[PDB]
Amino acid sequence: GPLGSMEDFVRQCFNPMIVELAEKAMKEYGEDPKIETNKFAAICTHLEVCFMYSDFHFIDERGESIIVESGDPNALLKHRFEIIEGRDRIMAWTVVNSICNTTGVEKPKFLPDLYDYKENRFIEIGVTRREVHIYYLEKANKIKSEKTHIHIFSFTGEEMATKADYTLDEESRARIKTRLFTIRQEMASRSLWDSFRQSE
Ligand SMILES: N#Cc1cccc(-c2c[nH]c(=O)c(O)c2)c1
Ligand SMILES: [Mn+2]
Ligand SMILES: [Mn+2]
Ligand SMILES: [Mn+2]
């Protein structure tokens, strides 16, 4: 088949808000989306996974964790997750320090991706084109002292999470895996996958 551009794929297959946040992140990282295009797609994918991980999850009027897949959650419901990824540096740390000084949860040394108000911990989300256990170790070694819970997804459906604690129900994680499969399949149809996979 014809070779598409990764740029075209990103703009056509991710929500514009995700794309914009990804562009802003790369600018902050000092990287040009039009040159580091595999990176651009990876950043969009990881941001989307962070959003999907948080989607629909609330803590109810009684303080238990519930899933509300409707458009209207009751106004007394609080979001279960704080989302850290996607914020600029200053705002991301502002949100972290707030959570920390508020919950007593110690300050992480690197920005994590989410905070889970049910499990009372930060989460680092990983998305990898390689085997989950290798990527897991890489994340953990960067994290060192671990308060922060790690959850890794691969494009082929494997997962690895700290202490075999996967946080979410199967259906939620299935949504994420289905989305990753869709991304891979679409990339493949445009002949972008092999390089995207190899570039990690
Ligand atoms: N530059 C760059 C780049 C490329 C691919 C992925 C990421 C990334 C960002 N945040 C994360 O939390 C993460 O787990 C990965 C960053
Ligand atoms: Mn980031
Ligand atoms: Mn992050
Ligand atoms: Mn992450």
Short mmCIF file of C-alpha atoms and ligand atoms in Angstrom, two decimals:
data_model
loop_
_atom_site.label_atom_id
_atom_site.label_comp_id
_atom_site.label_asym_id
_atom_site.label_seq_id
_atom_site.Cartn_x
_atom_site.Cartn_y
_atom_site.Cartn_z
CA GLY A 1 0.00 0.00 0.00
CA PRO A 2 0.94 3.70 -0.19
CA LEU A 3 2.95 5.19 2.65
CA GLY A 4 0.97 7.80 4.56
CA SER A 5 2.40 10.60 6.68
CA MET A 6 2.40 10.24 10.42
CA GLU A 7 1.24 13.87 10.59
CA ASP A 8 -1.90 12.98 8.63
CA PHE A 9 -2.53 10.02 10.90
CA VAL A 10 -2.21 12.07 14.08
CA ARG A 11 -4.53 14.84 12.90
CA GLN A 12 -7.13 12.43 11.54
CA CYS A 13 -7.18 9.84 14.33
CA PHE A 14 -6.74 11.87 17.56
CA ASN A 15 -9.12 14.43 19.01
CA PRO A 16 -7.91 18.00 18.32
CA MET A 17 -7.52 18.75 22.05
CA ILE A 18 -5.16 15.81 22.44
CA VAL A 19 -3.15 16.89 19.41
CA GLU A 20 -2.84 20.45 20.69
CA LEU A 21 -1.75 19.30 24.16
CA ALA A 22 0.79 16.99 22.52
CA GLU A 23 2.15 19.86 20.40
CA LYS A 24 2.44 22.06 23.46
CA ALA A 25 4.26 19.27 25.32
CA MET A 26 6.79 18.76 22.53
CA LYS A 27 7.47 22.50 22.36
CA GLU A 28 8.15 22.37 26.10
CA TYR A 29 10.34 19.26 25.59
CA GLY A 30 12.25 21.13 22.83
CA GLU A 31 11.13 18.73 20.07
CA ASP A 32 9.45 19.56 16.76
CA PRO A 33 6.27 17.52 16.03
CA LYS A 34 6.96 17.75 12.30
CA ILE A 35 10.35 16.10 12.64
CA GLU A 36 9.99 13.74 15.63
CA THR A 37 6.76 12.40 14.22
CA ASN A 38 6.86 8.95 15.82
CA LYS A 39 7.37 10.74 19.12
CA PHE A 40 4.39 12.98 18.33
CA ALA A 41 2.16 9.96 17.78
CA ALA A 42 3.48 8.28 20.91
CA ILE A 43 2.81 11.41 23.00
CA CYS A 44 -0.74 11.66 21.62
CA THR A 45 -1.33 7.96 22.32
CA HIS A 46 -0.02 8.19 25.88
CA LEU A 47 -2.08 11.32 26.60
CA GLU A 48 -5.22 9.60 25.28
CA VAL A 49 -4.56 6.55 27.44
CA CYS A 50 -4.22 8.81 30.49
CA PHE A 51 -7.58 10.39 29.67
CA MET A 52 -9.22 7.03 29.02
CA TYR A 53 -7.87 5.63 32.28
CA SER A 54 -9.64 8.46 34.10
CA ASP A 55 -12.84 8.50 32.03
CA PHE A 56 -16.11 7.57 33.75
CA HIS A 57 -14.59 6.98 37.18
CA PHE A 58 -16.08 8.82 40.11
CA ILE A 59 -16.29 8.65 43.84
CA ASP A 60 -19.92 8.70 44.85
CA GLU A 61 -22.02 10.69 47.32
CA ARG A 62 -20.92 8.11 49.92
CA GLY A 63 -17.25 7.91 48.98
CA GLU A 64 -17.09 4.62 47.09
CA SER A 65 -15.72 4.20 43.60
CA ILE A 66 -18.25 3.96 40.77
CA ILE A 67 -18.40 3.99 37.00
CA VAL A 68 -20.72 6.42 35.25
CA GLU A 69 -20.62 6.06 31.49
CA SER A 70 -23.46 8.51 30.92
CA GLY A 71 -23.15 12.11 29.75
CA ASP A 72 -24.64 13.40 32.99
CA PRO A 73 -22.97 12.30 36.20
CA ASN A 74 -24.87 13.45 39.30
CA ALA A 75 -23.56 16.84 40.43
CA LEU A 76 -22.43 15.47 43.83
CA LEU A 77 -20.04 13.00 42.19
CA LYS A 78 -16.33 13.76 42.34
CA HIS A 79 -13.80 12.66 39.72
CA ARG A 80 -11.80 9.72 40.99
CA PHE A 81 -8.60 10.74 39.23
CA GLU A 82 -6.62 13.94 39.02
CA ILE A 83 -4.92 14.20 35.62
CA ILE A 84 -1.38 15.58 35.73
CA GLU A 85 -0.14 14.73 32.24
CA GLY A 86 -1.08 17.27 29.61
CA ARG A 87 -0.54 20.28 31.88
CA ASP A 88 2.39 22.62 31.37
CA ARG A 89 5.26 22.27 33.82
CA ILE A 90 4.21 25.03 36.19
CA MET A 91 0.58 23.91 36.41
CA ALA A 92 1.46 20.22 36.68
CA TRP A 93 3.69 20.81 39.70
CA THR A 94 1.12 23.20 41.15
CA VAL A 95 -1.44 20.38 41.03
CA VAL A 96 1.00 17.82 42.43
CA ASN A 97 2.15 20.01 45.34
CA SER A 98 -1.46 20.74 46.16
CA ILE A 99 -2.44 17.04 46.25
CA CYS A 100 0.65 16.31 48.31
CA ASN A 101 0.46 18.93 51.00
CA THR A 102 -3.27 18.11 51.15
CA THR A 103 -3.19 14.31 51.41
CA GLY A 104 0.14 13.87 53.17
CA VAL A 105 1.23 11.78 50.19
CA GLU A 106 4.89 12.63 49.76
CA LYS A 107 6.08 14.64 46.76
CA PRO A 108 7.24 12.62 43.78
CA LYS A 109 10.52 13.60 42.16
CA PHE A 110 9.24 13.29 38.57
CA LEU A 111 5.80 14.34 37.37
CA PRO A 112 3.48 11.33 37.44
CA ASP A 113 0.46 11.01 35.15
CA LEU A 114 -2.53 10.66 37.47
CA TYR A 115 -3.52 10.79 41.10
CA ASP A 116 -6.02 8.20 42.31
CA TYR A 117 -8.22 9.57 45.11
CA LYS A 118 -9.59 6.07 45.85
CA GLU A 119 -6.25 4.29 46.26
CA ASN A 120 -4.56 7.49 47.46
CA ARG A 121 -1.52 7.22 45.19
CA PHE A 122 0.06 8.74 42.13
CA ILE A 123 0.12 6.64 38.97
CA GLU A 124 2.70 6.52 36.21
CA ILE A 125 1.10 5.35 32.95
CA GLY A 126 3.30 3.61 30.42
CA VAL A 127 2.50 2.76 26.82
CA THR A 128 5.06 0.64 25.00
CA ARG A 129 5.72 -0.96 21.64
CA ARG A 130 8.10 -3.37 23.41
CA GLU A 131 7.52 -6.09 26.00
CA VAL A 132 5.81 -4.71 29.10
CA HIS A 133 8.27 -6.12 31.65
CA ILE A 134 11.26 -4.35 30.10
CA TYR A 135 9.44 -1.05 29.91
CA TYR A 136 8.15 -1.58 33.43
CA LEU A 137 11.69 -1.88 34.76
CA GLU A 138 12.77 1.25 32.92
CA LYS A 139 9.97 3.29 34.50
CA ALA A 140 10.61 1.84 37.93
CA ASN A 141 14.33 2.51 37.77
CA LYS A 142 13.63 6.16 36.95
CA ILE A 143 11.14 6.26 39.82
CA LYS A 144 13.45 4.54 42.33
CA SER A 145 11.79 4.93 45.71
CA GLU A 146 8.25 4.02 44.81
CA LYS A 147 5.17 5.50 46.30
CA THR A 148 4.09 5.89 42.72
CA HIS A 149 2.10 3.07 41.19
CA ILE A 150 3.12 2.01 37.69
CA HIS A 151 0.73 0.73 35.06
CA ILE A 152 2.09 -0.34 31.67
CA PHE A 153 0.08 -1.10 28.53
CA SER A 154 1.42 -2.60 25.33
CA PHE A 155 -0.09 -2.30 21.89
CA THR A 156 -0.70 -6.08 21.82
CA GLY A 157 -2.77 -6.17 25.01
CA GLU A 158 -0.25 -7.16 27.65
CA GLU A 159 -0.19 -5.19 30.90
CA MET A 160 2.09 -5.00 33.88
CA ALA A 161 1.36 -3.12 37.07
CA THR A 162 2.99 -2.66 40.45
CA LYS A 163 2.32 -5.56 42.82
CA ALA A 164 -0.06 -7.09 40.26
CA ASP A 165 -2.52 -4.39 41.31
CA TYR A 166 -4.25 -3.17 38.15
CA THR A 167 -6.42 -0.47 39.81
CA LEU A 168 -9.27 -0.59 37.30
CA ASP A 169 -11.85 -3.16 36.26
CA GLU A 170 -11.34 -5.33 33.17
CA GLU A 171 -13.81 -3.39 31.03
CA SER A 172 -12.01 -0.06 31.51
CA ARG A 173 -8.65 -1.56 30.69
CA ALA A 174 -10.28 -3.38 27.74
CA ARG A 175 -11.38 0.01 26.32
CA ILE A 176 -7.78 1.18 26.43
CA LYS A 177 -6.44 -1.98 24.84
CA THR A 178 -9.07 -1.79 22.10
CA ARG A 179 -8.04 1.78 21.35
CA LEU A 180 -4.36 0.79 21.21
CA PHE A 181 -5.19 -2.06 18.84
CA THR A 182 -7.12 0.37 16.64
CA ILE A 183 -4.16 2.76 16.56
CA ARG A 184 -1.74 -0.03 15.62
CA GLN A 185 -4.08 -1.40 12.92
CA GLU A 186 -4.64 2.02 11.35
CA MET A 187 -0.91 2.83 11.42
CA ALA A 188 -0.29 -0.54 9.79
CA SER A 189 -2.79 0.16 7.01
CA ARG A 190 -0.91 3.39 6.26
CA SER A 191 2.45 1.51 6.45
CA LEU A 192 3.54 3.60 9.48
CA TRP A 193 3.55 0.84 12.11
CA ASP A 194 6.87 -1.01 11.62
CA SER A 195 8.90 2.18 11.94
CA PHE A 196 6.79 3.51 14.78
CA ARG A 197 7.33 0.24 16.64
CA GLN A 198 11.05 0.12 15.91
CA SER A 199 11.62 3.74 16.89
CA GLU A 200 10.86 3.24 20.59
N1 LIG B 1 9.74 13.52 24.09
C1 LIG B 1 9.08 12.62 24.31
C2 LIG B 1 8.20 11.45 24.62
C3 LIG B 1 8.01 10.44 23.70
C4 LIG B 1 7.19 9.36 24.01
C5 LIG B 1 6.57 9.29 25.24
C6 LIG B 1 6.77 10.30 26.17
C7 LIG B 1 6.12 10.24 27.51
C8 LIG B 1 5.69 11.45 28.12
N2 LIG B 1 5.06 11.41 29.41
C9 LIG B 1 4.89 10.18 30.08
O1 LIG B 1 4.36 10.13 31.18
C10 LIG B 1 5.32 8.97 29.45
O2 LIG B 1 5.11 7.80 30.10
C11 LIG B 1 5.94 8.99 28.16
C12 LIG B 1 7.59 11.38 25.86
MN MN B 2 4.69 14.85 30.26
MN MN B 3 3.66 11.88 32.34
MN MN B 4 3.53 8.15 31.59
#
